[PDB]
């Protein structure tokens, strides 16, 4: 996207979101990142929404095919699951490459740095979902390490009701439950996150209260499923 203006790439990313053209959206935001400037709060959201939708469709397809493959256990189901899996890993590697070159190293504010490290944890988590044994462990630790650094910063620098802090804790708890085989850690983190946000709600405006309580309900939904 080297010949397109940064502002035009951002404008077209917003258009693609409205048209539910998420592959286009991700390509526009990739081009915007590669212009080399830091991203605004809104721009970080556009980057995240685009790739979350792209990889979300790939993950859903991978699970359908993996289930068919398991039930069957010719080469076609395995071959096609491998194709989808390779395309998913390519998208994850692309996002991780953007974070590493050079979004994270240039992110100095708590809001931007925690946001990018949460992303890094998420896309290693998606790699971990399809990994089998070999570097499954190293991928899992890469996800853990990214989430952990984001957690440490968010606890130092953000209020307990901050939506990025809350969503980070939500996803790290899903990591514990689904990836790390640590359901007790998952439940403990979700509970402590919810209770500390509850106690800080009195400080919020009506609009911030709605933002925070929305994500708190997601934590509650998981606790209800897990206990």
């Amino acid at each position: 996207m080297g010949s397109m203006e940064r502002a035009s790439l951002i404008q077209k990313a917003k258009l693609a979101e409205q048209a539910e053209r998420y592959e286009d959206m991700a390509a526009f935001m990739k081009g915007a990142v590669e212009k080399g400037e830091e991203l605004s709060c809104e721009e970080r959201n556009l980057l995240s929404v685009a790739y979350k939708n792209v990889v979300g469709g790939q993950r859903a397809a991978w699970r359908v095919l993996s289930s068919i493959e398991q039930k069957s256990n010719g080469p076609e189901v395995r071959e096609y699951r491998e194709k989808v899996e390779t395309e998913l890993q390519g998208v994850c590697d692309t996002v991780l490459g953007l974070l590493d070159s050079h979004l994270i190293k240039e992110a100095g504010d708590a809001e931007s740095r925690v946001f990018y490290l949460k992303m890094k944890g998420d896309y290693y988590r998606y790699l971990a979902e399809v990994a089998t044994g070999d570097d499954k462990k190293r991928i899992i630790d890469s996800a853990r390490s990214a989430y952990q650094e984001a957690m440490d910063i968010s606890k130092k620098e953000m209020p307990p009701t901050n939506p990025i802090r809350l969503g980070l804790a939500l996803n790290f708890s899903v990591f514990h439950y689904e990836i790390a085989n640590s359901p007790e850690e998952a439940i403990s983190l979700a509970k402590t996150t919810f209770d500390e946000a509850m106690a800080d709600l009195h400080t919020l405006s009506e609009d911030s209260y709605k933002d925070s309580t929305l994500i708190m309900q997601l934590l509650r939904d998981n606790l209800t499923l897990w206990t």
Binding site: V49, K52, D122, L170, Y177, L218, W226
Partner: peptide, 9 residues
Amino acid sequence: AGSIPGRRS
């Protein structure tokens, strides 16, 4: 288990 839906913004 639901992660952040994060599909809309």
